[PDB]
Amino acid sequence: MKKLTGLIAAPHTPFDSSSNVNFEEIDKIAKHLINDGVKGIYVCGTTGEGIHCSVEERKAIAERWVSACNHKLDIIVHTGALSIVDTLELTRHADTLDILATSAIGPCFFKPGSVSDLVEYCATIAAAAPSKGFYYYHSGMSGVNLNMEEFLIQADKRIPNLSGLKFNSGDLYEYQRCLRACDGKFDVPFGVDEFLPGALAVGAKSAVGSTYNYAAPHFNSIIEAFNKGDHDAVFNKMTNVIELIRVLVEFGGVAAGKIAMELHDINAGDPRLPLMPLSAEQKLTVVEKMRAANFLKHHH
Amino acid sequence: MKKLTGLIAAPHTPFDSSSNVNFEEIDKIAKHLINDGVKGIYVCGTTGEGIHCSVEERKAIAERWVSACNHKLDIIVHTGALSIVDTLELTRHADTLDILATSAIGPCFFKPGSVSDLVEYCATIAAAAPSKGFYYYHSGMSGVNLNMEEFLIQADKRIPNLSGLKFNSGDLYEYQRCLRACDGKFDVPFGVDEFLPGALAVGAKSAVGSTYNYAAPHFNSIIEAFNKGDHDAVFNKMTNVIELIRVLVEFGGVAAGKIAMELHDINAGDPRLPLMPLSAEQKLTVVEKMRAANFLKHHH
Amino acid sequence: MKKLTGLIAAPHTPFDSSSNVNFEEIDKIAKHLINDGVKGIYVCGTTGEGIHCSVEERKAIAERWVSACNHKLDIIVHTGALSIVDTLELTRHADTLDILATSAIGPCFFKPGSVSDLVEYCATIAAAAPSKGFYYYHSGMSGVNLNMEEFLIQADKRIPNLSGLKFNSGDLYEYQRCLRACDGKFDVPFGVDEFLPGALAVGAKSAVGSTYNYAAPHFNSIIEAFNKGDHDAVFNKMTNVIELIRVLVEFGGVAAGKIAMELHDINAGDPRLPLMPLSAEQKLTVVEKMRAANFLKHHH
Amino acid sequence: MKKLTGLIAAPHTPFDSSSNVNFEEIDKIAKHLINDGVKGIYVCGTTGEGIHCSVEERKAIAERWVSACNHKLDIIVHTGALSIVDTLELTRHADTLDILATSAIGPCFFKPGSVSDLVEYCATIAAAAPSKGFYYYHSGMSGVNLNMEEFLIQADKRIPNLSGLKFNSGDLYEYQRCLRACDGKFDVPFGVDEFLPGALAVGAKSAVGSTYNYAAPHFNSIIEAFNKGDHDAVFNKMTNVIELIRVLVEFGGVAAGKIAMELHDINAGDPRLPLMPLSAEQKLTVVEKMRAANFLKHHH
């Protein structure tokens, strides 16, 4: 298996003014991602509001990404839902698409209470797309707080198509144990963009995140600086990352990140309820503060 | 408006050995509930595993309850889902049925961050079933930890069909503030069965819960004792309730509660993933310990 | 053993304008408590800011209460501190006083990680005052979240002078299991004043709390109403309790409760850092809102 | 001001078999720390069990470190206690010693509820040792979860001897905002040893921690490798760090870390209650697993 490298964007699902999926904007985001140096996409995940879409919408969205990317990006589709019936309907559909892997986030209502229980849930899902890899997505936001090192070690026995897990957590001690589980066999992309050089320094080889939708060249420059050992340059580039994150924290991560796509000529619309929309004034503020953060390049 | 009185069961969704909905067992549970002195049902809620079912299954389940109850019970249908599209499809369907009210539990992934935001989400839902009442279901398990007194006061302005909220929380200080919000206008059924006499004592008039599926006569006897001021009798009856709850805590609330339906000749099957099934040995243990708890009556 | 009955106040430690202990005001509070129908006191606890005082101050405070009460109240002294050396110095001193029992709250920094560990810590403390009873104080605020039923069952074996535990938690399911542990052997006073009728209804015989410092006659009237089965009267009296609690939540429980002592001609001063003082305007507001809550009696 | 550099050990307080302070072992630890390449010490902190010692013991301990270090290490004394009276008695004593700075951890029982409140508490403490620097110690274990960037910005106005804060938290996004607060003015040593290269990569210049008591040469080699950009070497050295941490998690951080001092001929004894002692078998296991982790050097 080849572990992912570089930046994996978790794209938005653009909604038009009637809160319907805007498929033409999905086409424009894919071209943008390819031009800005992203290597893969994780679709219908948290940033993608996949759980805000119906099964029918999710199936059309995953097909739209596969057509829009024209084989130039690795594609991972998140198929998780609270109902195993919906999840299995999405996962079976995903096994028919030209994609790299499926994935499921920890269920957030009845939360798996042990590693063994979580392994059984993931094994049922991964078996419905046995031709594709399978990533567990460890979320924090899910409330599923189980030992991920043990998850990889136990799931290795039970899930034949296991790829590894996406680590959306700041716990670098657990992350480094995951990197080493089963002699380093599994692929463990890191998922906290504002911690990126910290994860690089302890062994991350790829990162999945939402800011890569609009700041990928800037983060690729952090990766290159870190690699060259230019730690001064990593530091000054993270100053612009911290100003970006501040906009997300003030205005909402999905909402502000959607508006930030205007910096690349993309109209991603508002989020869906229960996420709230920004006002017309707030949208102008988001774009002005993202410009002031100074991470944009006038090129690809 | 007439506030609910007495016990409102949150019924299970029985699954057969292929994990499909068992509609004939729904018929048998409804007859049982009516015979055991339940006054209403809250369907497709947490105990009902509504979020484990697809939209199509949920619509068939709600119709099956309305046919099976033959107008003898008040029916509240929980229509909440993580996708507002699914929620609105269920809520519109529910507005066509002969039921009392719809309801939605706090979304557990992106959690409403203020009372105002939660009021906007509930107002969008309640407007899709404007002919029926609407209860918010306050869950704890949802992770949506906002001031429910303020929710009622703010939602009163914004939701014309607001009935009140179901209070699945042990916070009796917040519960009593809810009972009094807007001069006592709203209906606030209590939702923690093992605290029942405590909520009675501070003003509860009805309770919604899962143990009422199989212990309703016993809890109706607590209500009658409390009413008569026989606090000794309340105490000795709660000793049997505590032995019941211990079985739920040891073996899982949905799983053990489903097996307990065998005490009334009902085969409710296993839960769905991510909830795990009990072994054949554990199912025999659940039934023996529920018998030993001594809350069953050999009559209706 | 005779279980405590009625209201046990947790008195404040009055501080003068130099933040020194005001011993003469302790005398005035004791006379007040006896006149207002309190039956016991729990001194140097949370409301008492015992952990804000030095070992030397704490020893003088406990002696001042014993002199001021003139044998008319049962006295429990909280001797807990983060240092076992301080705790044991206080506990040994307390064994020499004419008091009913000592007590310790769960340590809040390194928190006992199992019931067994907590039993060993309490056994070491209770052995330093072997002539007096010993109550564990279960606090929530402590962060020590262990099964208190199991604590009583395990400590029964290990602590010869064990009296029971004071239950400052809203978990009525755990509270009722404590009431029944070892065939109902232990004394378990309830500790959430705004839940009082709820705990009465499930078996509480006494309650320890801070509002009893200034609202004892009103809560004694709730106890009498509940006993007579006058649930309407319990309800209308709890309306005044909820208006009292609102003042505590808005202005701080220790700070506002200290100012409320002005309603009984007592100058309890400000709290100590890290608790902040109220402004002169806020102190006038606290007293006006406590008057408006309408729980005061113009008599004893 | 010169920011700290390199490793700052948080030493243990050795206890003999009567649970008294072993002052002669303090002498031996200081010589060891100086020989193993530590640059400073943070005494009477969490690893030091300072809160388990009385005020009188704490004063003798701080004096013993100052005599034992013979001016070869920078010394920071943690003076925090739950009672401001104890804290101020310790802080005034510390102002008389030849040390670099005092420090206080967030109080864990009544927790400061705003940045402003925490600034007022720290300002009162730092003013009692106005000749020494002052570090706030941000702990997580304290439960004091306030914005530390805002703490530095607000405290800059109010505390004339403010040095900065010790950051015992894995939140690298907050840590990098602290590094930059007030144009990078404050000294912010990092406090999570198992995350060290991650904090290096985002700008840490020093680290305070307990593993530096017995693994300082190994972590100094990580610092040197990271500096040279040898990320392969950082990775393989962190494999030995993860095996060390596993021993702490299995057997208790203070208890196992005390036993690990046997690897340097130091008898640090057991912790004090409420921390539990290891059995004779467990102590042999701790030393065997710390040897197997392979981070020890047969030299200084």
Author numbering:
A (entry chain A), B (entry chain A), C (entry chain A), D (entry chain A): 1 to 300
Sentences copied from the publication:
A crystallization condition, composed of 25% PEG 1.5 K and 20% glycerol, produced diamond shaped crystals. The crystals diffracted up to 1.65 Å and belong to the orthorhombic space group I222 with cell parameters of 67 x 86 x 118 Å3. The whole amino acid sequence from residue 1 to 297 could be traced in the electron density maps. Three of the His residues from the tag were also visible in the electron density maps. Electron density clearly larger than water molecules was interpreted as glycerol and ethylene glycol originating from the crystallization conditions. There is one molecule in the asymmetric unit, but the crystallographic symmetry generates the functional tetrameric quaternary structure. The active sites are pointing inwards toward the center of a donut shaped tetramer. The corresponding residue in AsNAL is Asn168. This residue points towards the substrate and is positioned closer to the substrate than what is the case for Thr167 from EcNAL, or for an in silico mutation to threonine for AsNAL. Our structure of AsNAL shows that Asn168 is able to form two hydrogen bonds with substrates as ManNAc, Neu5Ac and Neu5Gc.
